[PDB]
């Protein structure tokens, strides 16, 4: 997509050539709002506003609204008007950046959900006397002026060597009105973008605040004002009228305010990179201001506590298998009991970033140690015990990554009388320890990236549960197959955990006390082929259904952003409660004591859920 700014300064360059000379009564006007419209159409719902004052005189303001769910929207305004007695000439300086500036925000802030809606406004005819701003205010009511969480203003962004971002004449009342100024003076602090604001010099014009533009109307009511215009405040009478300390001149006017003048005196470099320093920062304002950098932090938060859920039932789904392979083994040549009969090894897992369905792209891969023993009398029930430590680093995306050790402690008792039918049961008990570092990647559509900012944090998890599973079956040859039916159950539980990152998009999460019932019924296949003289193959497959009684995993979390702290329900999305797991593979023996093995378990879901992963571990029966 466009890079920042030049989208905003292919608009400049189509409203100074192709619509030049726009004031009251022109066609230039109206062929300039129609351009106005048609650049930041897109995902708004923009409608041009046609007013009157003072009978006969009359113009129109485009005004593109984005429904906020909040129901209080933040007005941008900026005119894109020249001086009256200036027919038929381009005025750059007076607003056309600032038109362009305005687009670009608007369009980089499409198709994009924000809690609070934005009402991009461009004014017109503000040269004949601030007409288009007080004439959209009083068409606003009792609840737009109450919904009005505030406006920024845009004004001249090119001519003034240093900008400036100055909050209105009302801010010597509230010393709490000037926020919007505030917040973007961090944000162009932090964005290494230099922004200065009104030094206060002249006792004229209160410190630090504006005069003479869009948010005069604006500033009937105490609702933050931001006026953004680039001038020099310390040149000339300071009151910012000899806006550049270069040659060049100043104002709107027809001996000067050229394309090609302004061009050859402060260089078409200089022009552009503070349309795009604008750009960037207003962008980063309005994300930060009207709160979309928090839904979509909140919404990233969301799919990153799904990941580590699905993260977590993954690592103790890796348990129960490998309490299956056990129990694969224990089937077959019982042996007295007693005696040493202790397994130990290390097992690692590959998943395949097929998987997807969370929206992170979750590519996984799994290692760490495990510990197996089990003996008791009479050579048909056995009980014994298991020590894991898992490591699944699962991936997210645009350098997302969760990493956690986990402790597992599970144990397991098999029956069988010899027979055909067996059956078993399990307990399992998890101390994990995640250490999140997610990414918050929100960026327009084709538009460029608005914000990359990384959290991290460090949480603990417990889980618990039960589980049992058992079956009979008939054999042709030497190798045999039926239907196994199990009960799993684990609830888990993460605690909850604050991101370490100061920031707007860091997140403060809540405890997770919810539990998982994976009732199943399928087939399982288990065989010996004792290819050589101490090799015993194992072939082994599985497809089984699941079906939760329960919510399975936690669906909305109560979610508090670190910049503003209210409360958020951000939706996970939906929980396959239908669906069905498969296994295949098979355990090898290189002597009595040491064997490899290599399962590929693949959840199905023919809607949605199609996770996949793969397994190879060795194990050492000692
Ligand atoms: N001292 C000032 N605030 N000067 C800037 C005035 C800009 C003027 N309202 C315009 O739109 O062209
Ligand atoms: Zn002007
Ligand atoms: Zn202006």
Redesign the pocket.
Known sequence: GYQYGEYAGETLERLITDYPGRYRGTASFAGASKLMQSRLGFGYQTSRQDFTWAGNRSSQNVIASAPGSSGKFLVLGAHY???YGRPTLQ?LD??ASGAAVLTEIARNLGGIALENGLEVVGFGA??EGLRGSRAYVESLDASQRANLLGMINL??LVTGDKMYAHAGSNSVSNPALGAYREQILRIARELDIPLFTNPGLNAEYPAGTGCCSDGESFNGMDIPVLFIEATNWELGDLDGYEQTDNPAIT??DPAEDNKEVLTNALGQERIEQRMRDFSRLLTRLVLEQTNADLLASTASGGALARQMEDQLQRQHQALTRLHDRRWLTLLGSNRPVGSFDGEVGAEGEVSPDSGFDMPGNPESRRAGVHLLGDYRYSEALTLGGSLAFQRSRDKLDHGGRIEGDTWQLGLFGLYNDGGPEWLAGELNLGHTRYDSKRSVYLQAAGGPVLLDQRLSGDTSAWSWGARLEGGYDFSFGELRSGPLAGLDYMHYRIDDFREDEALRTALGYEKQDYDSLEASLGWRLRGELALGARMRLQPYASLRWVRELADGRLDDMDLTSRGDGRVRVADMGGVDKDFGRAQLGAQLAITEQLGVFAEANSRFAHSEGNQAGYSLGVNWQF
């Open positions: 008007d020249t001086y005025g007076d607003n503000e040269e004004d001249s104002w709107h």
